[PDB]
Design an enzyme around this catalytic site. Sequence first.
Site, short mmCIF file in Angstrom:
data_model
loop_
_atom_site.label_atom_id
_atom_site.label_comp_id
_atom_site.label_asym_id
_atom_site.label_seq_id
_atom_site.Cartn_x
_atom_site.Cartn_y
_atom_site.Cartn_z
N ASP A 12 0.82 -1.21 0.00
CA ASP A 12 0.00 0.00 0.00
C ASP A 12 0.85 1.26 0.00
O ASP A 12 0.58 2.19 -0.76
CB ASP A 12 -0.95 0.03 1.20
CG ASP A 12 -2.21 -0.79 0.97
OD1 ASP A 12 -2.74 -0.76 -0.16
OD2 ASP A 12 -2.67 -1.46 1.92
N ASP B 150 0.47 -0.41 5.47
CA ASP B 150 -0.62 -1.14 4.84
C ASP B 150 -1.92 -0.71 5.50
O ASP B 150 -2.21 -1.09 6.63
CB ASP B 150 -0.43 -2.65 5.02
CG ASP B 150 -1.47 -3.45 4.27
OD1 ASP B 150 -2.68 -3.15 4.41
OD2 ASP B 150 -1.09 -4.39 3.54
N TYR B 151 -2.70 0.11 4.80
CA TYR B 151 -3.97 0.56 5.34
C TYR B 151 -4.87 -0.67 5.37
O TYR B 151 -4.96 -1.39 4.37
CB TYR B 151 -4.63 1.62 4.46
CG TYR B 151 -3.75 2.78 4.04
CD1 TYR B 151 -2.82 2.64 3.02
CD2 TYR B 151 -3.90 4.04 4.63
CE1 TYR B 151 -2.07 3.73 2.58
CE2 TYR B 151 -3.16 5.13 4.20
CZ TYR B 151 -2.24 4.97 3.17
OH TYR B 151 -1.53 6.06 2.72
CA LIG Z 1 -3.99 -3.38 2.59
#
Ligand SMILES: [Ca+2]
EC number: 3.1.11.5
Lengths: 147, 50, 204, 146, 408, 147
Positions: free
Chosen positions: A83, A96-97
């Site tokens: 991300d 990493d959302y």
């Molecule tokens: Ca993600």
Amino acid sequence: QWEPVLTEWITAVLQAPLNETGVSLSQLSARNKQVEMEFYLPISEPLIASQLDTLIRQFDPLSAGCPPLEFMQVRGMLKGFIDLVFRHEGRYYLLDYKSNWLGEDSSAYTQQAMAAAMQAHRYDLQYQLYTLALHRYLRHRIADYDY
Amino acid sequence: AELNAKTLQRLPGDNWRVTSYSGLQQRGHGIAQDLMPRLDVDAAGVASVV
Amino acid sequence: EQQWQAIIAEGLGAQYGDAVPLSLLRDELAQRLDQERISQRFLAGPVNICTLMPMRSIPFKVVCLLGMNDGVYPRQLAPLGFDLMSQKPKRGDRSRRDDDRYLFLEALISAQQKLYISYIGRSIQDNSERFPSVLVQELIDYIGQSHYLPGDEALNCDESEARVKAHLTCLHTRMPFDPQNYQPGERQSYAREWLPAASQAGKA
Amino acid sequence: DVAETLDPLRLPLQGERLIEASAGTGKTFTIAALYLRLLLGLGGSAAFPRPLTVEELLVVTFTEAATAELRGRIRSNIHELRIACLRETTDNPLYERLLEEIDDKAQAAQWLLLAERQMDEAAVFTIHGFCQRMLNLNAFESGMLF
Amino acid sequence: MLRVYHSNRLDVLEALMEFIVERERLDDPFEPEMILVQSTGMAQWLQMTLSQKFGIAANIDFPLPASFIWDMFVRVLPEIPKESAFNKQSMSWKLMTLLPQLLEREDFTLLRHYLTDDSDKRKLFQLSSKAADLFDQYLVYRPDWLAQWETGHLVEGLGEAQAWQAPLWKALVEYTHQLGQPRWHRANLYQRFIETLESATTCPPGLPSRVFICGISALPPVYLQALQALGKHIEIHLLFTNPCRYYWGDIKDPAYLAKLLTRQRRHSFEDRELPLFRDSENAGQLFNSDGEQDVGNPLLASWGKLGRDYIYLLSDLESSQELDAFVDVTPDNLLHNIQSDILELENRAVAGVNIEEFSRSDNKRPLDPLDSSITFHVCHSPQREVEVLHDRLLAMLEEDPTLTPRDI
Amino acid sequence: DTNWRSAPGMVNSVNKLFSQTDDAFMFREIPFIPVKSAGKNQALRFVFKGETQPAMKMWLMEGESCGVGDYQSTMAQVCAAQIRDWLQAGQRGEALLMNGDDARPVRASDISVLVRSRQEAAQVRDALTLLEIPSVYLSNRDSVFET
Ligand SMILES: [Ca+2]
């Protein structure tokens, strides 16, 4: 009618203190950001689920919850999207959302609850893998780099 | 009828594939990671009276 | 939801005043959806069955071409007719005809070890005969005109040619359980499943 | 009244001609012949103004299998008459009576070469294929949808 | 520099790309390595090929040509909006609000009736599109056409339809102005792009380090020039996979011919070129007025039609520096024989022009009944046709090992 | 004018029949002009249990009256009989298709029964099938779904 809640939600996450000294998305300018990185880690010599579970254990206290080795032997490549990867003029990072939960409210997003869903979805692997990629990449690019 | 069918003496052996932290996530994402390569594969489900 | 938003945003961008009838959007949502192609599994779990994509001539050890029948391969579509550019051509121009024909060439060029060429020889109904895509014709025709089997060294151009084309051309059977598929030699089937019936070893 | 016994090679290739191909009279052998003549502009007084291209000789059959065979039979005749132009010698009927009408076997060989590689676009469609083809080209006049 | 590499197999060209990267470390501030490509397939093939001979492939961008050229426009030129306001899409819409007004003109009488008889914005939208589609095309092939129509001028020699397209285009441009949108297309901007690059002979304003162009056997005349001018401050490695080592394209002026008698350098060694001194240019190759009346090999003759064009346009560049990378093809197989012919630009076909030639048959190459490369199969139906293949794939898998399925 | 493809005996019989009255196709605009049979075929003949048979043979039922019913049960029967008659006499090399001095035994693949409708076909297929003579109706439209 979601704009207020949303426009207030985004910011709250931006100006959020990451680990410690400074670091907050809002402090990241274009030049220090690389969004959605797609990597390919070749993998020769079959990757055995069990063989990997061992070392993953010794170094990670999270992967101590050892159910693992849920996949089977695989030779080839290793796709993966990151991300976000940025740099706080000193180091590089992995973001990493993760939009998840329906788990009511706040109480479910505590350092405990989170580290729980972590093994729950075995995201821990994502870590080791992803970083192993950024490693290979940074080492490749930054001519003479150290972990 | 003096026939017979060739029988291959080779064997499957190894399998080259290109996995992706999918050796984890059990299927259901079948054709999903195909139609939308960047779909938020990490989420799924329905919602109710919340 | 992606295409839907796309199609609409795009229309808003160009600032369209008047209203829109559903048909407009549905018919477009359809088309897009018809063109969006899925091919994520292109190079992982082996053996790739696909179409001839222009600008994607990768080298493979084995290259198989199926359905290379006349009227089927060199894929067509006539220019709008009011596409000025198509009547008065120039070096830069492009058209499907050209793209496909140069595709067939990229195959031959990219086939490192084996080139497999197949087409349908007759419809399993009126049994009338069909024909191989001209392109395939131009290949064996060249083969035959520049080769000769060991036996036939002193006979004739046309005569040595025939034997060559005929030798590389392999007329298959209608049914898979046809015994010819189970004698010895050229492509004995690897499907024992049919063997018993091929050998009339049934019990009425 | 009462038609002239048709002699393909001497048929005037200029406007309106009705040909009655009785039961198994080689209607196909005739068509091909006439096709070649046209391509190489052969004939004489009974010839056509200029030479035509594969994509100018319109041939309409009713069947689908028809156009396939017709299209097939022709690519062949061309490949031959062309070869029989490079050898300037042929020992098989039709063709020979054709080379005698040819004035520059070396050119016809070239002209023909193109006709060969052009066949994957031969104007040989069905009544129906011809229609929707003209239609979809002149959309405005036919008020057709693209 | 705009380096042009002609190779026999994508492998060697992938090789040269592999080396270009190992050499100049390239910077690394998340700077994306760039590779223009025209098919996801390539992007995937490269990505995997590269992750191997390097241990990983991470950034790499695979912009389509058209999207690259415009990327640069924004960079070089002053204030260019990201994304033209004349993109195929928006064009269709803007053309839909215009056409209705442009009818009843005498000009558009043809559309005027086509659109009346009936509709519900169905005919109007297909047109507004097929139109926008065409314009989008003219903006690349014939970009001067528009600059012409924009001022009302027509162009001698085009079919009708220009009768309405020309006004329509002038009409779209004017309308887009009133809307208040960046007048900049792709045609009114390529000339300037080059001029400001071709001049300002100082340095690269701040574009990318090195750029590759892989697996694209065709590019527009204008995109090439655009790259040419760009290849004066940037390193452009255009990897073109060519089926023949010699020059098989056509020729302009018998004056342009000797300007082609130059030479291509091996990427590492030095100079090469087409055979037979003069005789070659002479003889029949580039006969009468036309092009290569012989194009040697007859297969490369009737098929590579698209190739000729691209190869001919590449050798019409000046700032270019093409070089050989053709690897040989020893003629042991029927496949290798044919593949070889196409490479050496030679025709081994025998017509039998004379009884001497035609009577014997040992002048042609010996076949080998055992040779299975290049086989032909005639089946009764698609099912049958696929069942048969599965058998022979099985066979040829059994045959020689080493052949994994991914190789098919 | 020339009818390649067919036997002299045939072309002669067909021409004779359609030359009877004037305007056989009864339409002054559709006149019938005979046709010359090709030379390469002058050798064609069909011998059976002895000598060469006539290019055309008319089988006439007896009686004064005859319903559409009869002229089918009886004609199919008759037809059927003559087929096995050629076939059996074919395996015994007594039924031959000859081009001058060349010959070959008639095989099922050589016989053909023209018909006007599905039924008629069945009518034939049945009397045939009654004599173990297998057949196939080339103009069958039924679908695999009602089998
Ligand atoms: Ca993600």
